[PDB]
Write a protein that binds this ligand. Structure first.
Ligand SMILES: Nc1ncnc2c1ncn2[C@@H]1O[C@H](COP(=O)(O)OP(=O)(O)OP(=O)(O)O)[C@@H](O)[C@H]1O
Ligand SMILES: Nc1nc2c(ncn2[C@@H]2O[C@H](COP(=O)(O)OP(=O)(O)O)[C@@H](O)[C@H]2O)c(=O)[nH]1
Length: 1795
């Protein structure tokens, strides 16, 4: 017990002699003598002179929480420790330091004048929370224990609240700990992601809390600005009024301000941190309850707390719930419901008391299981109902008393039911859209529609119908598809207003000519799937001049009559799948409006589908065939041999080359193209000229031949018969190649030696050769091939007769008709062949385009791309339109040069040094031609020489070859086609980023690659033949691990996308005989894993059919192999493993259509997956498995939060799972829910679409079709995370199967003409059109649905009208500039997608409501609004451009500027006094001459001059001073001497009224320059005016009760900033001051009257204006001075700089929010107001001056009035949060692509 004296003497001695292992003992003595207060302090005060220090400090301070000021000693010790070793805070916070510091800063220190201690404590905490992680852990450790004050103080200091665990983060735990609602309200109102709030919602549903949910919902589902409750997607199993209670608004909500404790603490901590850092009604209507699986809603049918808000509901949604029997009490409580839709619920009978609501419409119960009869109560009258939707129930009879109940019904929908018997009269008076589709209706009673004289859209599909009951003469749209009709009945022929007729799928016989329709306004005639033989139109065609769509597909058509050219307005003709047309009439060329015209499954009189043929080229072609056509006489006679033959020695005698001057020719290089014409001296003068291509036979060029083997050809073939019956076998590779490349081309075998002998090989040529997989042999001769003889003349005659009768698809190719333009261009190319340099006969596009100008060819830029191609086919000039092959500008005339050049490197060998392995080479050679040489070889992939490359295969020893880890898939085919491997080993080669950029070391011989990354990732695409096999197998070995399969699925894809691209004859099922298919893609597997001695063959087709299961097994079913080990491509297991279907969880029923709700009779259904809702997209039989697999590989790696993300994909059936967009596409939204778009959701959709485009264009892929049908919303709650999402299946479907021009209306100008290839600047134009249709809310779409030709051609140039003048809409004029930017014709003048997103992100785009350009050179220093008229307001202005008085009226909705001189002296400021009697509001004129002039609002003549003051009046005000037990008001005229002229509200009418109580306040040289009023009305409107430099205040006394001075400041940094004239003052919890040229505001107070704050402007400007403003370095004499103040209610304070800037200061916690520059030049006057029920706007009267004539010392002023949305300070930070959240989501989604 002696330690006390010891420590006392140590404390005495540690001070005087400057003392120098004591600390260990003084630490231990605490634990040896604990709890003794007298020695605790003696120790701690000495510690200020191993974490045991912390371990004993925190525990001591905890055990001595509030004893006395030993806490002062301990905290002094801690601070002394930190200021030398700051990292000790990491250990303090580690042990317990929060448990003591929170109790300290919460031990009722407020109201305790112990501030000297709290200052120390906060100074310490400011350093404890230096590191960000320390803050984020102090927050976590402050949220467990319920401590609202400290958790808010920690939030005001940063310390984000979305970092704890991201699945069990702050709120996720806080909701479990039964926290206080005030604690959750602080986490929510600060930064907090949505996905965690949604999880916490469920947790707090688990418990019963009526204030933690009601605060979670208010941030999850409440669009307060739009009066909505978007509670849809939540799986809230129940609904309680105690939850929605505080959601509804109520006026009685008003509170005190007690959180200022947290503000004080946070500001003191921040101050110490900085000092340490620098030195050292409005009833809401929409109530959405869609996805909440409500099993009953009776909880609302009580007398609950919200039973008063329901009487103004006006919309209620309950669709997709599990309800039943809508409660009786409810449907009577809400007496203003006008949109009740509840479908997909499990109802059982239509209540029929639902109609007992007062004013209802759009009653929608349209997926329930309503019973057979729906008998309606004959005593309830509901004449308000419009749309009685009842689709997809189990009805057996039309509603019973429909007539006498709903008279004014408009669209009775009854589809999907089973209405069976012949219906009833149904005398409804106001129907407009009937609907009875998919019922079982045999026939209608012939008086059915006889009494509904307004029907317009009768739609009865899929019935069993044969007759029509006298349709009313007002019929417009009539859909009768899938009926069982035979003839268009007379009831449809006689409708004098018909406008559309959908009668597909009926076995019709007679489509009547236009002389039987009696309706001059046909627009659409859909007639697919019928049996229509004739297309009678010759009768009278011009009556149909308006038919815009004529679908005749799948009929028995024979020809299209030539009268079809009269229907000029025809837009989309369809005659596909007829298979018996065979010819198009040349009159179709006049249908200039056709934009799509399919050619599926029919053969015509021309070659189409080249790379274009987009239904627009066909119109030009058939129009040019209308000018003048000439038969085309030219074919290709390709020769083929092998390395020795009569090829160049037989050709010389076919063409009868008389000279043969070359005494001895040599082997051919290349192909040696020639021409030879045959003017047949006969009765027929057809001078056919066919160009032979005498291919080279030497075995080294073979990989370049398959380029020049086309289908329009009549191949020869030569044996060199000298080697009898041995070459016929040795020549079969050539015939096989001919069959592979050009299946439908003949052959003429020619044994080319009889001068030397064994011609019995005719037997073998007849037995093995004629009809076994080989092409259609058409003859076989035995020429001599050196001299003319009858045998060779018979060969010439055979060639003649075969060419003139080639006739593919019965077309007679050598005599088809073509436009004269092509023959003309051909003659010009032949004439120009003679005038080109031999060393470089290439021609550039410009020179040819000059040749056509020289001639009179009528070809335009849209004509040549077909012209040169059709002249390319005929072998006249070679052109390569492959865009990847960047040489499309070159036009190779005389191909016999290019073909010899491309083959000259393949013969130059080196007899030097073989330093490189055989086949690899470097660049060894002329002037700039050598570069293009191997820029063409590589373009042909012949570059590394894939020819002459190591024929011998090297023995490679793969690591794993144990019959169980290897996957093999043979490819048995008769022979390798000619240019197969050099094509194949060049497609697998250049794919380096496998396993996606790590390339493997490859060792490739001629016929194999073996690229290996490692023993687990390799691939050997070999080439060997089994024993006893005349074929050649392509073994592909791959390790069966998961990584390996990717390789397998990627190589089978390359070897299939090649075979159908180059050799379509192989994989062509020869139905004749048997489907040998010429390509047996075997698969190898063995049940006995390892040492099975064999792998059992199994055709891949026959195995594909065994996909009903997943296991393959022999006839002995005990052991089995999974399919995913023998063919991992058929099962989608090669692609990222996350996209396997997992059918055990996918709950989905294709068969029903009421689940097809996604899209009107589309193909995508709605289903459940992983217990969640998704949208599966069933494909039809068209999409082959390979093509679906090809689209999935590109779809699987987009993964953006603005793109429909893939979820699964499988077989049984071929489906595709994607995310479900709840609110459907956008076009339906803006077509039927136009009141939902709310000027901040219209912006969120645009932002999300711009983000989608900015991400697509990053991956170098353009969308090509962006229209309101491809934008799929997800929720209508604006401040959400994911709202819009562009459907991305289209881009994959295109990039795989290459509508390519886009929808007509939503299409760029560069895209409609099609002349040029597109760019990222076409999606931007389409996005601009999307923005114009969002702004006008789909006005252009609706109007263009009746003017499509003008819906397209008006916008095909950048000439679309003004969104405002045409369609009524809010101007929102910071996007009309964005539109006028994105709607330019020059593509690179349109902003790229990154900009159009980065200028959509600006939060002054969503808040600038309208900018109003004042007239040129109008100077106004005073404005005033009109608020007593809430219908429209006006802004009376003054005049500064004249020294004579003039007030300037200005309306707002009309922008009608009215000028009226009303005085003789410059006006300074105004005020608007309203008088509640006589219904007017007089306006005042304060003039510099001193006359107070007043004029009335309506009459501009009842003007009377008030009492004249002394000097220039400077400020006025209209008060709220009703202290006489009634309503009363004054006017406070403040002269430039202080003599405040007060008045009375009604005496102002008096000529020269009485200034009531005039007080001389200041001096004539101390000018009054402001006047204002308190913020609340509780203090009885205490007025606070500035005066010169003297600030005062008063009340109903009108006497100075405060005369505070501001010049006398003890915070002098500069004098004139404080010693200058005051400008404005605003009154709140503090006082804010503005002075002339004073760039700083001084925060004064009411009571203490002290400088509570000094807030500089450029201390915010010069922190953003650092790098973006470089010239400002010489601008040290900075401009920008406070010219005005205006305080938002309690959120922020707006400071207008003298420059063009405007500040947003959150007065409460954080100062700078944003700086909104570059919209004006001087914010001269700023005020708040209310405009047309959209109250709370912030007027800003800016300037705009241009130095056009600044040299004349004159400036061109443009006073730019704007109208900001006062909710801007919330918007800017909410958007800053919403963008960061989507960045964080795009990152998490980009991590999913990795794994
Ligand atoms: N993920 C989704 N969520 C919600 N709705 C969707 C989704 N995907 C598509 N839809 C809707 O389904 C409808 C059908 O879309 P689809 O892609 O089949 O159109 P389409 O390709 O033009 O049809 P078709 O191929 O028959 O011409 C569209 O109207 C679209 O709004
Ligand atoms: N003696 C003789 N020689 C022939 C006959 N037919 C072709 N040839 C020879 O075949 C050679 C033609 O070369 P060719 O094989 O066509 O060149 P390649 O096809 O491009 O490889 C000539 O040199 C002729 O000598 C023939 O009937 N009699």
């Amino acid at each position: 017990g002696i330690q006390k004296c010891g420590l006392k003497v140590i404390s005495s001695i540690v001070h005087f002699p400057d003392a120098l292992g004591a600390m260990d003992s003084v630490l231990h003595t605490l634990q040896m003598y604990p709890d003794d207060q007298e020695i605790q302090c003696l120790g701690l005060s000495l510690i200020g002179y191993g974490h045991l220090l912390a371990k004993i400090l925190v525990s001591s301070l905890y055990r001595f929480k509030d004893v006395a000021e030993i806490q002062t000693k301990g905290f002094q010790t801690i601070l002394a420790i930190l200021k030398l070793s700051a990292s000790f805070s990491k250990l303090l916070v580690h042990h317990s330091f929060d448990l003591v510091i929170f109790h300290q800063m919460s031990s009722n220190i407020m109201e305790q004048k112990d501030q000297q201690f709290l200052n120390l404590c906060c100074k310490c905490f400011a350093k404890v929370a230096m590191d960000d992680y320390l803050k984020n852990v102090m927050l976590e450790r402050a949220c467990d224990q319920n401590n609202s004050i400290m958790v808010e103080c920690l939030l005001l200091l940063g310390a984000d609240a979305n970092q704890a665990k991201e699945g069990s983060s702050l709120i996720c735990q806080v909701c479990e700990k039964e926290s206080s609602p005030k604690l959750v309200e602080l986490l929510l109102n600060s930064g907090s992601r949505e996905q965690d709030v949604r999880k916490a919602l469920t947790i707090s549903i688990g418990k019963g809390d009526s204030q933690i949910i009601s605060l979670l919902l208010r941030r999850l589902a409440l669009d307060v600005a739009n009066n909505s409750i978007c509670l849809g997607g939540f799986c809230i199993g129940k609904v309680e009024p105690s939850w929605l209670g505080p959601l509804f608004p109520d006026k009685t909500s008003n509170l005190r301000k007690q959180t200022n404790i947290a503000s004080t603490l946070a500001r003191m901590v921040i101050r110490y941190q900085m000092k340490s850092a620098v030195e050292e009604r409005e009833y809401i209507t929409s109530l959405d309850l869609s996805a909440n699986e409500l099993r009953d809603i009776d909880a609302l049918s009580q007398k609950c707390c919200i039973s008063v808000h329901l009487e103004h509901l006006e919309k209620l949604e309950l669709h997709q719930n599990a309800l039943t029997s809508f409660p009786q009490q409810l449907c009577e409580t809400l007496k203003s419901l006008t949109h009740l839709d509840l479908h997909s619920n499990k109802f059982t009978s239509f209540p029929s008391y639902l109609l007992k609501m007062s004013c209802i419409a759009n009653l929608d119960v349209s997926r329930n299981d309503i019973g057979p009869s729906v008998v309606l109560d004959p005593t309830v009258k509901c004449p308000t109902l419009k749309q009685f939707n009842l689709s997809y129930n189990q009805l057996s009879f039309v509603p019973e008393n429909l007539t006498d109940v709903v008279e004014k019904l408009e669209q009775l929908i009854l589809e999907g039911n089973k209405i069976s018997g012949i219906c009833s009269p149904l005398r409804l008076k106001e129907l407009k859209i009937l609907n009875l589709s998919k019922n079982h209706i045999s026939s209608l009673s012939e008086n059915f529609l006889e009494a509904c004289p307004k029907v317009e859209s009768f739609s009865a599909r899929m019935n069993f119908l044969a007759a029509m009951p006298f349709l009313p003469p007002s019929m417009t749209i009539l859909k009768l598809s899938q009926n069982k009709f035979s003839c268009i009945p007379e009831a449809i022929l006689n409708l004098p207003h018909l406008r559309s007729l959908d009668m597909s799928s009926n076995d019709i016989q007679y489509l009547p000519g236009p002389a039987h329709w009696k309706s001059l306004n046909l627009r659409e005639l859909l007639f697919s799937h019928n049996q229509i033989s004739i297309l009678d139109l010759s009768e009278k065609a011009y009556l149909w001049s308006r038919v815009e769509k004529l679908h005749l597909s799948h009929n028995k058509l024979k020809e299209i009559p030539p009268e079809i050219g009269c229907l000029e307005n025809l837009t989309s003709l369809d005659v596909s799948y007829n298979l018996e047309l065979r010819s198009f009439p040349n009159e179709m060329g006049k249908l200039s409006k056709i934009w799509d015209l399919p050619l599926d499954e029919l053969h015509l009189n021309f070659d189409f589908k080249h790379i274009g043929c987009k239904a627009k080229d066909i119109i030009r072609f058939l129009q040019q065939r209308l000018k003048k056509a000439v038969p085309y006489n030219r074919m290709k006679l390709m020769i083929v041999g092998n390395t020795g033959s009569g090829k160049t020695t037989l050709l010389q005698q076919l063409m009868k080359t008389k000279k043969s001057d070359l005494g001895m020719q040599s082997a051919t290089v290349g192909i040696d193209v020639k021409d030879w014409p045959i003017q047949i001296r006969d009765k027929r003068k057809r001078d056919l000229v066919l160009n032979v291509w005498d291919f080279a036979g030497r075995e080294e060029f073979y990989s370049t031949h398959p380029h020049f083997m086309t289908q329009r050809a009549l191949y020869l073939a030569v044996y060199d018969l000298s080697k009898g019956q041995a070459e016929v076998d040795a020549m079969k590779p050539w015939l096989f190649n001919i069959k592979a490349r050009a299946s439908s081309s003949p052959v003429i075998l020619v044994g080319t030696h009889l001068d030397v002998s064994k011609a019995c090989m005719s037997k073998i040529t007849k037995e093995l050769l004629n009809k076994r997989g080989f092409p259609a042999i058409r003859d076989y001769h035995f020429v001599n091939a050196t001299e003319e003889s009858d045998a060779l003349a018979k060969l010439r005659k055979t060639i003649i007769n075969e060419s003139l009768n080639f006739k593919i698809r019965d077309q007679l190719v050598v005599g088809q008709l073509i436009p004269d333009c092509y023959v003309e261009l051909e003659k010009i190319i032949l004439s120009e062949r003679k005038n080109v340099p031999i060393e470089f006969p290439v021609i550039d596009r410009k020179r040819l385009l000059q040749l056509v100008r020289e001639n009179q060819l009528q070809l335009d830029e849209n004509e040549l791309p077909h012209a040169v191609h059709f002249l390319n086919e005929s072998g006249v000039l070679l052109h390569f339109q492959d865009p990847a092959l960047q040489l499309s500008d070159l036009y190779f005339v005389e191909p016999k040069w290019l073909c010899k050049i491309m083959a000259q490197i393949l013969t130059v060998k080196v007899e030097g040094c073989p330093k490189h392995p055989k086949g690899i080479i470097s660049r060894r050679d002329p002037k700039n031609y050598m570069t293009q040489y191997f820029k063409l070889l590589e373009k042909f992939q012949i570059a590394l020489v894939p020819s002459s490359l190591s024929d011998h295969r090297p023995v490679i020893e793969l690591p794993h070859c144990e019959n169980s880890e290897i996957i093999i898939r043979l490819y048995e085919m008769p022979y390798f086609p000619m240019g197969f491997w050099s094509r194949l080993i060049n497609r697998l080669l250049e794919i380096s980023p496998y396993m996606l950029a790590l390339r493997p070391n490859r060792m490739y011989w001629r016929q194999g690659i073996y690229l290996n990354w490692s023993p687990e990732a390799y691939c050997l695409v070999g080439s060997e033949v089994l024993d006893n096999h005349p074929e050649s197998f392509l073994k592909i070995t791959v390790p069966s691990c998961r990584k390996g399969c990717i390789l397998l699925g990627q190589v089978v894809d390359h070897i299939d996308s090649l075979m159908e691209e180059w050799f379509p004859g192989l994989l062509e099922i020869d139905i004749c005989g048997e489907g040998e298919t010429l390509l047996k893609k075997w698969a190898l597997y063995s049940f006995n894993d390892g040492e099975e001695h064999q792998k059992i063959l199994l055709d891949d087709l026959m195995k594909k059919a065994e996909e009903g299961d997943l296991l393959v097994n022999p006839d002995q079913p005990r052991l089995t192999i999974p399919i995913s080990q023998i063919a991992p491509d058929l099962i989608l297991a090669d692609l990222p493993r996350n996209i396997m279907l997992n059918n055990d969880e996918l709950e989905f029923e294709q068969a029903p259509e009421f689940l097809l709700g996604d899209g009107s009779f589309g193909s995508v259904y709605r289903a459940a997956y992983e217990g969640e809702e998704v949208a599966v997209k069933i494909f039809n039989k068209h999409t082959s498995l390979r093509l679906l697999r090809q689209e999935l590989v590109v779809l699987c790696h987009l993964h953006h939060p603005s793109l429909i993300s893939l979820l699964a994909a499988g077989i049984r059936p071929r489906m595709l799972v994607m995310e479900l967009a709840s609110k459907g596409s956008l076009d339906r939204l803006l077509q039927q829910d136009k009141a939902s778009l709310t000027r901040t959701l219209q912006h969120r959709i645009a932002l999300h679409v711009a983000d989608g485009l900015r991400y697509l264009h990053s991956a170098m892929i353009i969308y090509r079709d962006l229209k309101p049908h491809n934008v799929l919303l997800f929720t209508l709650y604006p401040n959400a995370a994911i709202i819009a999402k562009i459907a991305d299946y289209s881009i994959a479907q295109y990039c795989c199967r290459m509508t390519s021009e886009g929808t007509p209306g939503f299409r760029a100008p560069e895209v409609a003409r099609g002349n040029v290839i597109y760019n990222q600047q076409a999606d931007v134009y389409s996005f601009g059109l999307l923005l114009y249709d969002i702004l006008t809310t789909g006005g252009r779409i609706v109007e263009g649905l009746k003017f499509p030709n003008e819906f397209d051609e008006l916008e095909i140039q950048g000439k679309l009208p003004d969104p405002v003048k045409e369609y009524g809409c809010a101007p929102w004029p910071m996007v009309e500039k964005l539109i006028k930017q994105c709607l330019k014709e020059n593509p690179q003048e349109r902003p790229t997608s990154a900009q159009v997103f980065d200028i959509l992100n600006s939060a002054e785009l969503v808040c600038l409501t309208r900018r109003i350009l004042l007239p040129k050179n109008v100077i106004v220093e005073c404005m005033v609004a009109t608020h007593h008229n809430s219908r429209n307001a006006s802004i009376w202005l003054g005049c500064g451009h004249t020294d004579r008085g003039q007030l300037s009226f200005l309306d707002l909705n009309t922008e009608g500027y009215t000028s009226e001189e009303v005085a003789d002296s410059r006006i300074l400021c105004l005020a608007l006094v309203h008088l509640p009697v006589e219904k007017e509001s007089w306006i005042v004129s304060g003039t510099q001459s001193g006359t107070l002039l007043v004029i009335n609002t309506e009459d501009g003549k009842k003007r009377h001059t008030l009492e004249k003051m002394t000097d220039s009046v400077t400020c006025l005000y209209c008060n709220s001073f009703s202290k006489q037990s009634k309503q009363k008001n004054f006017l406070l005229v403040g002269t430039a001497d202080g003599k405040l002229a007060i008045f009375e509200d009604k005496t102002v009418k008096l000529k020269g009224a009485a200034p009531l109580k005039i007080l001389n306040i200041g001096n004539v040289s101390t000018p009054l320059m402001c006047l204002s009023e308190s913020t609340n009305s509780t203090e009885r409107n205490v007025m606070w005016g500035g005066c010169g430099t003297k600030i005062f205040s008063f009340s109903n006394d009108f006497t100075i009760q405060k005369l505070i001075e501001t010049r006398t400041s003890q915070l002098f940094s500069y004098a004139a900033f404080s010693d200058s004239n005051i400008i404005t003052v605003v009154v709140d919890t503090a006082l804010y001051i503005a002075k002339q040229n004073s760039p700083v505001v001084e925060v004064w107070d009411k009571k203490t009257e002290k400088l509570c704050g000094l807030i500089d402007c450029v201390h915010f400007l010069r922190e953003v204006t650092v790098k973006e403003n470089k010239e400002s370095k010489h601008k040290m004499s900075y401009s920008g001075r406070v010219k005005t103040l205006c305080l938002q209610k309690n959120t922020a304070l707006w400071i207008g700089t003298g420059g063009g800037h405007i500040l947003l200061l959150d007065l409460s916690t954080r100062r700078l929010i944003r700086v909104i520059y570059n919209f004006c030049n001087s914010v001269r006057v700023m005020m708040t107001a209310q405009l047309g029920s959209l109250k709370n706007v912030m007027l800003v009267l800016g300037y705009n001056r241009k130095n056009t004539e600044g040299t004349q010392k004159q400036k061109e002023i443009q006073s730019c009035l704007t109208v900001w949305d006062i909710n801007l300070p919330h918007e800017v930070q909410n958007l800053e949060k919403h963008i960061e959240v989507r960045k964080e989501l795009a990152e998490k989604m980009r991590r999913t692509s990795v794994e």
